[PDB]
Design a protein around this ligand. Structure first.
Ligand SMILES: NC(=O)c1ccc[n+]([C@@H]2O[C@H](COP(=O)([O-])OP(=O)(O)OC[C@H]3O[C@@H](n4cnc5c(N)ncnc54)[C@H](O)[C@@H]3O)[C@@H](O)[C@H]2O)c1
Ligand SMILES: NC(=O)c1ccc[n+]([C@@H]2O[C@H](COP(=O)([O-])OP(=O)(O)OC[C@H]3O[C@@H](n4cnc5c(N)ncnc54)[C@H](O)[C@@H]3O)[C@@H](O)[C@H]2O)c1
Ligand SMILES: NC(=O)c1ccc[n+]([C@@H]2O[C@H](COP(=O)([O-])OP(=O)(O)OC[C@H]3O[C@@H](n4cnc5c(N)ncnc54)[C@H](O)[C@@H]3O)[C@@H](O)[C@H]2O)c1
Ligand SMILES: NC(=O)c1ccc[n+]([C@@H]2O[C@H](COP(=O)([O-])OP(=O)(O)OC[C@H]3O[C@@H](n4cnc5c(N)ncnc54)[C@H](O)[C@@H]3O)[C@@H](O)[C@H]2O)c1
Ligand SMILES: CCCCCc1ccc(Oc2ccccc2)c(O)c1
Ligand SMILES: CCCCCc1ccc(Oc2ccccc2)c(O)c1
Ligand SMILES: CCCCCc1ccc(Oc2ccccc2)c(O)c1
Ligand SMILES: CCCCCc1ccc(Oc2ccccc2)c(O)c1
Lengths: 268, 259, 259, 268
């Protein structure tokens, strides 16, 4: 049978077929998980994408900034999975940061309203999503978010890095809350994955300064990674998340698991 | 002679005489530094307090949330220290967080507008302050801010801990920008210092504070901010010229010990 | 089907039925793995114990200090699993340290020959074991060893903590060598598990152990090694194919919490 | 006056004029510190070198493996500084590792007797040196050793990296011991410094594989370092040690201070 048999897992974050949450959903379903998906803006668009999944699953609207979406989320899920049923897994795979705070723009030229908006979506929403769903979660359940190692600074990532340093702090705190329900909360720190913005800067959407930079950071990842790293394959990352959602890591919470090919453990 | 002779150092954060920034200023002055102090809201009040310092130094108004204070900050400092003169050191010792996101309030009940306000004052202001002053800073200068180890979660500190996780990340980036000026940028992670909440808090804080002194191999006195103020001066000095984007712990070593 | 179906996994470290390696083997077998077990000194004794496992598996002699056991290890495994067959997983669950360098003895009174013996068995043997078996391992295989967070110092554990700081460093290097074979290499940092020393120890261990369960957001039961044995199996499986040279914590989250 | 006025500091580790301990001594003396030096093998040779210091200081023999040198060390120092006088600072700047465990040799081909010998000298000796001198140290005193960030693996450094991971663990423990005497114990994690072996592999003492590698790791250090890093200047490292020996860091022990130009805090 499948890694996640008879587990009901909410997976947010799907926008395209290159999304990390798309492959987290695909694998979860491949491992026999009943899913519940959420989407942010282009619900019609994500309907077309989510239809390309192994199995049919309810799709709810969730704008983590929206105070109404959050207040109503549990009940909507209750309706979708069926009264008397609970969640065994929540996948937070949400991120955002205006151009001002990430990319070619000077680190010091990001206005706070932009940084604030990105932290809200990339860091605080993890707590508010756990606050909504914790109540309708089963003991032994698992909440996992996506992270990008922010231990050290780097070019381009700038204020996103500061948002991810927030998310890791938030995660350890959400573990406190989540423990009172016997639920774990961890983050999967993945190496770079080609999606849209990052698989666009290739040719040079950001210019010759950028491109040739990210193309360097990415490149070095595959060298540093003792088992290597293919930025065009989001499957290994997705499987790590499934391992976190499963029951084979029942004593690990408030933590961070690194799906980056070991790159973060090697200097050169 | 003093550790910081001839150094023009801007020091923010004083509000009372218990303020970590008060002792930083007091020690920097004792070590022969020319200070420029900034205050946030109660300028008259902090005038009373800053008058209790070893030496007289210009007091400017700075509210890190105010876009006008920031844009003008450099020019006003230039006028206080004199045209042609530049700063050798900047002390960010600013911290805030509404009760909603820190204390007895449940962690999940902090509304973002609050959390966001606290991160703006506690984390982002470090970058915006650096962005303002970096241009009027001398090579080999030092920017140092205050921190409280947010590596692990804990009761009460809650969202402040999240704001500090942000500062440390901001600091590594400010080190990048500051490098372009030959300027370092580090954080000093101090143990708790004394500067109502009920029986849970008076139990927790006095239990967390207590265990600090136990864990600390040299011990920890929460009623003395001097050890911390000296660590900030060592950072402002020239005896740590190769360290930037880093964090120096003035905590009695508590953070290196488990029990 | 099981997590580790069709996987040939070598598991060392069993000595009693409380041994973390016993439950690792028990769980790997419950998840349909073909095991090859190794034992150190009391082979007859561990035969009695290994007979208490779900399934029957070959038991080889391995004393990581013995240069002959190491050189022959591959060939003997080849013969047990069959020529042409290779290993998919190696479990290093070996640990030692004389009383001199761990327990009530003062930290400064541990003679090197002792400390060196403990590091040889507890740290270096991880590399020498990897060097022996890596050649008879399949791509996508997994080497996992046991660890106890040595980030911070603590009473009693003393030089074992130093030996574990070494293992973690050894592990990052074994990840390099192992990568050349498409093999991962990680450590599982478990909370204390039950497997005389006087009133100080019975006070400390029961105080350190106790506070573990408090710190742990999901709690921690030192009388149950199963959660730990499952984490080792998740590492041996294929649901963590992108993680190597790393450390997975099976400790109830205790290490992410301060108080 | 000087940073270390009227402080009596033992400084070991001087073998040549490029030694990190040579500059730690030179600066300490420049800051008005009474020194006590120790040497390992070529005492005659180090006599010639130590004579090139700002000021005259007693030179004792200390082979950290030798059980006799350790047992007699305090008394010899007592004699050199004068009965009734104590040390205010100890500088551990000792390292060793046979070619087998560091360089071009395969990581797996280092025999334990070699690794053991290097850990003994590079890690355990820090404890045994503190065990000898702690008794003749003043409250407020400072014990500092030299370290090289071993968080992540790297080429060439191999078993030395494993020795430094040991030393950092040892350091936190020595802090326990050292606290009972009101003495601090920290490590200075420096970036690479041209000495003898490392300033030899330049041309290619280790070959074209090496050289072009270390020359890469070194190079990248100066790029990653936001204030940059000059591998030909050991002065900034020495001054950090003096800051640790001084009284301007009285609340930091069992810790590690990084003198590497910030390189360890930057990814690219
Ligand atoms: N792609 C990578 O290289 C990689 C690596 C490390 C971490 N991550 C993290 O994984 C997560 C998703 O990454 P991805 O690469 O799949 O990105 P993506 O661009 O494919 O998806 C980002 C998601 O955020 C959603 N979103 C934005 N604002 C929202 C809001 N207001 N309310 C609800 N949803 C909102 C978008 O709809 C989108 O699905 C992010 O946290 C990202 O930082 C990605
Ligand atoms: N007190 C402790 O136990 C301790 C321990 C570790 C770190 N710190 C840090 O040191 C710093 C100062 O701490 P403190 O204990 O002296 O606290 P304090 O309350 O005495 O100082 C905090 C300062 O923040 C200033 N401030 C608030 N909003 C501002 C704004 N909008 N613009 C400019 N200034 C503003 C206040 O005027 C005040 O001077 C903080 O960052 C804090 O996190 C304190
Ligand atoms: N027990 C705990 O609380 C706990 C917690 C964290 C980590 N660990 C780690 O797990 C591993 C095993 O722990 P355990 O509690 O099962 O202890 P155990 O005493 O049951 O197992 C230790 C094993 O080391 C073996 N061993 C000793 N010398 C050997 C040698 N020369 N060659 C081959 N094998 C040798 C012994 O035979 C024994 O099986 C150790 O590395 C230990 O550090 C244990
Ligand atoms: N040089 C660097 O790039 C750098 C960077 C980081 C850390 N460090 C550390 O600084 C320390 C010294 O480095 P260095 O570059 O000055 O090296 P060096 O080669 O100049 O000196 C190493 C010292 O070890 C001494 N020594 C060796 N065995 C001894 C023993 N048996 N008993 C007593 N003394 C013994 C030698 O006599 C020598 O002085 C080492 O710990 C080293 O790892 C150096
Ligand atoms: C730009 C630097 C390369 C880092 C890799 C990377 C790529 C995408 C990332 O995720 C984002 C998704 C939406 C908004 C912001 C970020 C990220 O986490 C990490
Ligand atoms: C109640 C929290 C216990 C931790 C000790 C502590 C106390 C005060 C702290 O500083 C603050 C000052 C103003 C606003 C926010 C934070 C802190 O850093 C650390
Ligand atoms: C007494 C130490 C408290 C820590 C808990 C603990 C207990 C046993 C441990 O494992 C050992 C087994 C054999 C030899 C050395 C170590 C350990 O890892 C961790
Ligand atoms: C070889 C890789 C470059 C690392 C920089 C470096 C250079 C010298 C180092 O110190 C040594 C001194 C004596 C014996 C062994 C090591 C080191 O610590 C760190």
């Amino acid at each position: 049978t499948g890694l996640l048999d008879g587990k009901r897992i909410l997976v947010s974050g799907i926008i395209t077929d290159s999304s990390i949450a798309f492959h987290i959903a695909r694998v979860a379903q491949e491992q026999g998980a009943q899913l519940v998906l959420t989407g942010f803006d282009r619900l019609r668009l994500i309907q077309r994408i989510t239809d390309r999944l192994p199995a049919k699953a309810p799709l709810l609207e969730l704008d983590v900034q929206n105070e109404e979406h959050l207040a109503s989320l549990a009940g909507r899920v209750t309706e979708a999975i069926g009264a008397g049923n609970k969640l065994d897994g929540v996948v937070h795979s949400i991120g955002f940061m205006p151009q001002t705070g990430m990319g070619i723009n000077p680190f010091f030229d990001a206005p706070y309203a932009d940084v604030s908006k990105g932290i809200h979506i990339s860091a605080y929403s993890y707590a508010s999503m756990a606050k909504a769903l914790l109540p309708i979660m089963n003991p032994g359940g698992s909440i996992v978010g996506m992270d990008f190692d922010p231990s050290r600074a780097m070019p381009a990532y700038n204020w996103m890095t500061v948002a991810k340093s927030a998310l890791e702090s938030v995660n350890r705190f959400v573990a406190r809350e989540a423990g009172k329900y016997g639920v774990r909360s961890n983050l999967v720190a993945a190496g770079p994955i080609r999606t849209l913005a990052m698989s666009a800067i290739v040719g040079g959407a950001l210019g010759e300064e950028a491109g040739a930079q990210i193309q360097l950071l990415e490149e070095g990842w595959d060298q540093r990674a003792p088992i290597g790293w293919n930025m065009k394959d989001a499957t290994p990352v997705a499987k790590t998340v499934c391992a976190l959602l499963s029951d084979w890591l029942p004593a690990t919470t408030g933590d961070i698991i690194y799906a980056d090919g070991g790159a973060h453990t090697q200097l050169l």
